[PDB]
Amino acid sequence: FTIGKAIWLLWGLVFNNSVPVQNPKGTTSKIMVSVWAFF
Amino acid sequence: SNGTVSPSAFLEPFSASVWVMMFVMLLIVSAIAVFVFEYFFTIGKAIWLLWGLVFNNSVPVQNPKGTTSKIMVSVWAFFAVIFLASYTANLAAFIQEEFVDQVTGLSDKKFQRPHDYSPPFRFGTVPNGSTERNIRNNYPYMHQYMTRFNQRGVEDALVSLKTGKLDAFIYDAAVLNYKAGRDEGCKLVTIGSGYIFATTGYGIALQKGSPWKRQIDLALLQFVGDGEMEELETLWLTGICHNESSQLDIDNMAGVFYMLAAAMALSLITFIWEHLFYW
Amino acid sequence: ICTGPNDTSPGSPRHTVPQCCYGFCIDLLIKLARTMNFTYEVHLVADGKFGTQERVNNSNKKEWNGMMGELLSGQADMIVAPLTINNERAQYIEFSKPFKYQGLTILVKKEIPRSTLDSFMQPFQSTLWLLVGLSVHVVAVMLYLLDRFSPFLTLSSAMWFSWGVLLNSGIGEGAPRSFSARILGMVWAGFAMIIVASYTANLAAFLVLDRPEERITGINDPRLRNPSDKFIYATVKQSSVDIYFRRQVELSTMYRHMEKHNYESAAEAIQAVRDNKLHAFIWDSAVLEFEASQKCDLVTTGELFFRSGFGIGMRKDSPWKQNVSLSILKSHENGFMEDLDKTWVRYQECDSATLTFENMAGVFMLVAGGIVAGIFLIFIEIAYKRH
């Protein structure tokens, strides 16, 4: 998807405010999202 | 002692009735959510959504489509965030190390009957004193058992307690209070947080019929009335421990894992029950 | 069976009624009579005061009154009471070894933390609530205002998006489309999380260290040190505490307040403290501790000071002295005084979990209000559907 949508989902899970986002489908992308959200 | 933390320490943030009443109003709100959704998604989905809103883990839920359902779910989420903030505000304070004394007092079964316990704990006192005479006059069996673990001086008993070859030391209250105050790190403490058994006093011994008795008594009581020995105690008798964050271990939050295991057991039980019912 | 005055109030005839006396001192006297054989006739002092050195209206004369006046006049032979030992009392009579060590301390009415209906709304100012509400309204309108004129979201959709992303719920599944609306929504969500984090931190700070009056650090309290009209503290008039306060030089300013407010007996003082008439009561540690054990809403807070002991007094020369002192010392030595302390002092009901049902009741009341207003909202929606 677009870099803009990546920035949206990325920021919205940085600030866990139930922001409607388009989550990635790849497994390694999901790993990246999980570790980034732990941070 | 190495203090212990109650397993239900994370339940104390709210009284027992508070949890059950929030849960019943949760059920009521889920029921009315299903009702308003039907008017304009079963009960289970509503309950799951409500729990996930209270427990803001961003769990996958299916939001309703009705406007009034959305409104009441929003105010429910407001209640949820209020509750989460309130619970987290005092969570750190309640999860704290609590210190528990080894024994109750001189009347404890450990002192009276030291043999029936599998681990033999060692208590003793210096001889040729008033404490030994009192123990002899009160509990001859206790004195007979205690004579084996005798001590030579106050410092010898203190180092024996520090090392581990002794468990308790019975002696004059003021001396032990001073030693506990002046000890470093406060690894040693008097039982009962200042428990006193004989409650006698220190006096100025005089020969029988001495003429100095009355004058000395009056002078000492005059000192009592002017509070000078209060200054003397502050100068001499005070110590370090008298004036008075840590990592959380498994036992510190053992209640959380215990409830997790109970939830797993309930999971297996209800899974087997559903299997039997479906069959 | 003890003969005593019927009415403790002054200005009434004090008829000698034969009431019944029991408790700690009575049991101690009973064992004293059992050890050495002597029949006892117990009676109460006509004047409730403990008895201090007081200058009678006839000058050039110091008179002992109260229980000490009763004893020294030859009308009594032995006295049993929680009588503090001091120099003045020891000058004229001799005291046995103390049967209970205690000291002076301060009793205050424990302040139960009152829970207002606006406790949840307390951390944020009302004007701040109005400001955040107006901000919610303006952002909710301007989101779809900008989105509508985007050739490259409706009122309800944008409004519910705003409410969901401010309540951390997710009610509005719709999303803004134009990139300007994208940036505005992301920044508004950031603002909302800033608001909620500030609210959580403010509530945490307010909940901790929630104590309007810290403590009373004994007689060294600066609030206690400087008397004030609002801060009213007292003690039992004409007793040992009065003597201690009067004779001590540095505490003399304390005594300046003392004659302003005094009570005839300890019962009136504790009742006044319970009725919030008195801010502090100065009395013996044993009495105040027992009262706090019984009266669960009163607490002793001051650091223990003026350590002494309750003693049983006789005349200046009395053959009973040596034997009674030996008996009382033996009673301390064996397991009897501990038994009396257990059976007459130690037993208690409550002495003293936060955020109770009464503490955060406002959230339950607001949930009930929302429940009872949901029917009104559905009526309004039905009426709108009619139109």
Added chain:
Amino acid sequence: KPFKYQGLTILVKKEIPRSTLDSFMQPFQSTLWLLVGLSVHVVAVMLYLLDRFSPFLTLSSAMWFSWGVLLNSGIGEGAPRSFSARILGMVWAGFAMIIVASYTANLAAFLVLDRPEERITGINDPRLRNP
């Protein structure tokens, strides 16, 4: 007459609160990491089992659901089909919330105080009485 008024005082080291790479790993010890794994993996697989043997979501999807429960990613997309699996995800979400709240509270309590250097309170400090 004195030309500079001053008294006696004490000089000590600053004792900087300088932190290490594990400035956020203090609340839980190393063992709990294994334990927290033991709190998720064995759950995820059995959740898959609850879907596998249901009368009416693979292992990887169950693992993703459990991870998104543990950490607030918001990926979702792992809602199970069995009623028991759904209620188990719910209760595990509750326990994850409790764990994260405990983490936040413990770290906050750890970082609000970084005193233990224990600055001397002048001549009245108890350490000075007994050298």
